[PDB]
Design an enzyme around this catalytic site. Structure first.
Site, mmCIF file in Angstrom:
data_model
loop_
_atom_site.group_PDB
_atom_site.id
_atom_site.type_symbol
_atom_site.label_atom_id
_atom_site.label_comp_id
_atom_site.label_asym_id
_atom_site.label_seq_id
_atom_site.Cartn_x
_atom_site.Cartn_y
_atom_site.Cartn_z
ATOM 1 N N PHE A 1 -7.032 7.189 3.519
ATOM 2 C CA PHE A 1 -6.263 6.594 4.611
ATOM 3 C C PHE A 1 -6.680 5.144 4.808
ATOM 4 C CE2 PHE A 1 -4.907 5.835 9.018
ATOM 5 C CZ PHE A 1 -3.639 6.364 8.961
ATOM 6 N N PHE B 1 0.851 -1.194 0.000
ATOM 7 C CA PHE B 1 0.000 0.000 0.000
ATOM 8 C C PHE B 1 0.896 1.256 0.000
ATOM 9 C CE2 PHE B 1 -3.516 2.537 0.378
ATOM 10 C CZ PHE B 1 -4.628 2.050 1.059
ATOM 11 N N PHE B 2 1.973 1.223 0.778
ATOM 12 C CA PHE B 2 2.915 2.338 0.719
ATOM 13 C C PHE B 2 3.527 2.521 -0.661
ATOM 14 C CE2 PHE B 2 3.108 4.282 4.855
ATOM 15 C CZ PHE B 2 2.835 3.299 5.817
ATOM 16 N N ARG C 1 10.389 7.308 6.010
ATOM 17 C CA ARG C 1 9.445 7.844 5.024
ATOM 18 C C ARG C 1 9.260 9.368 5.107
ATOM 19 N NH1 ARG C 1 5.847 5.938 1.324
ATOM 20 N NH2 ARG C 1 3.973 7.249 0.997
HETATM 21 C C1 LIG Z 1 0.438 5.838 2.210
HETATM 22 C C2 LIG Z 1 0.005 5.809 3.677
HETATM 23 N N1 LIG Z 1 -1.113 4.944 4.117
HETATM 24 C C3 LIG Z 1 -0.984 3.539 4.509
HETATM 25 C C4 LIG Z 1 -0.231 2.617 3.532
HETATM 26 C C5 LIG Z 1 -2.225 4.973 3.135
HETATM 27 C C6 LIG Z 1 -3.525 4.312 3.596
HETATM 28 C C7 LIG Z 1 -1.622 5.680 5.299
HETATM 29 C C8 LIG Z 1 -0.748 5.627 6.571
HETATM 30 C C9 LIG Z 1 0.320 6.546 6.742
HETATM 31 C C10 LIG Z 1 1.145 6.473 8.035
HETATM 32 C C11 LIG Z 1 0.818 5.554 9.055
HETATM 33 C C12 LIG Z 1 -0.289 4.632 8.867
HETATM 34 C C13 LIG Z 1 -1.066 4.673 7.620
HETATM 35 MG MG LIG Z 2 1.231 9.994 0.372
#
Ligand SMILES: CC[N+](CC)(CC)Cc1ccccc1
Ligand SMILES: [Mg+2]
Ligand SMILES: [Mg+2]
Ligand SMILES: [Mg+2]
Length: 340
Positions: free
Chosen positions: A183, A80-81, A323
């Protein structure tokens, strides 16, 4: 020392960190998976993957998960990141066609993942692998709910693509609605269930205290990401951030916006503490002496425990993860772990 603008003494004192015992294996196994699925180049995996702390984030959240469940969750989260990174790069480079095609492939793969395990786009193949594994833990009804929620997430990413391409910064309320989707609030909430071994019936997971505790845990996490990720996002011309909506539409200075986002984050914590008492009372009430009641009670209690753990895991993640370390990059607009 957490920077003063980001420090939350209540999280530091009242939400003690937890770490799942599978974490050391998890770290290695997800790194190996990123390599095997070719989701990041080998040299960048070697230099950056552990420092990104993606496994740490999930191991501080889904306490009690079976090891295999935590592994699927961690691989999906790392995916997901990388997807957030791909989306960002497609926007920056104006790749409207490639984004539209990826968007369509993710919708299809989400519904039929085994069919996509060896897709030519390794980002689609990696998604399919993690999703197929996530679909092997609970009944099809839970899988369909995960899919329903993630189709919605994909479309919210599409909306972000068009906002950024058109230069539009969403209004404050428009953004808050959108942020529950970008999110992935409901995906993380869905994943509590395979983590405690039980698909909860609708009447249980839709109990107002369970719903509200679930919501506040995610609002905290999302808005705290906004607070901490604001500098990297301004540097990268990202427009989606509660702070940026406040600067753009409420005529706040950066300093004023940071303060207002902080205040909103802090209120989530104390709203959560109040509803947590109700959610744990509900867990107690489910334990009515029956076998089924004991199962449901234990599952709600574990889930609400993890809703609480998300606060501390997300808090510390933002201070530990590479990050967000924009001050360390030569080009603040281009994080070194992304494929440019
Ligand atoms: C790209 C970030 N994220 C999760 C993969 C998208 C849903 C949100 C997130 C950022 C930081 C901590 C927890 C979730
Ligand atoms: Mg982003
Ligand atoms: Mg994003
Ligand atoms: Mg962010």
């Amino acid at each position: 020392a957490v920077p003063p603008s980001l420090r939350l003494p209540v999280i530091e004192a009242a939400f003690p960190r937890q770490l799942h015992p599978y974490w050391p294996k998890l770290q290695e196994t997800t790194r190996t998976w990123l390599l095997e699925k070719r989701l990041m180049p080998a040299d960048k995996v070697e230099e950056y993957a552990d420092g990104l702390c993606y496994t740490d984030l999930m191991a501080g959240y889904y306490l009690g998960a079976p090891d295999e469940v935590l592994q699927a969750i961690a691989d999906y989260s790392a995916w997901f990141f990388v997807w957030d990174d791909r989306h960002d790069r497609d926007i920056v480079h104006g790749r409207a066609g490639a984004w539209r095609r990826l968007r369509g492939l993710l919708h299809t793969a989400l519904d039929s993942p085994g069919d996509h395990l060896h897709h030519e786009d390794t980002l689609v193949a990696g998604f399919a692998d993690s999703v197929r594994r996530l679909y092997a833990f609970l009944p099809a009804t839970w899988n369909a709910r995960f899919a329903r929620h993630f189709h919605t997430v994909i479309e919210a990413y599409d909306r972000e693509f068009h906002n950024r391409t058109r230069g539009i910064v969403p209004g404050v309320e428009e953004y808050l609605e959108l942020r529950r989707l970008t999110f992935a609030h409901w995906i993380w909430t869905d994943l509590l269930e395979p983590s405690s071994g039980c698909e909860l019936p609708d009447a249980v997971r839709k109990h107002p205290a369970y719903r509200r505790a679930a919501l506040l845990s995610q609002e905290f996490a999302a808005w705290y990401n906004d607070l901490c990720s604001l500098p990297k996002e301004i540097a990268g011309d990202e427009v989606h951030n509660l702070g940026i909506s406040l600067i753009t539409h409420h005529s706040l200075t950066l300093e004023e916006a940071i303060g207002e986002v902080r205040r909103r984050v802090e209120e989530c914590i104390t709203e959560f503490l109040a509803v947590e008492r109700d959610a744990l009372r509900f867990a107690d009430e489910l334990a009515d002496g029956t076998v089924r009641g004991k199962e449901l009670s234990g599952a709600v209690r574990a889930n609400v425990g993890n809703m609480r753990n998300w606060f501390s895991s997300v808090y510390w993640f933002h201070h530990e993860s590479g990050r967000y370390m924009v001050d360390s990059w030569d080009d603040r607009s281009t994080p070194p772990y992304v494929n440019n």
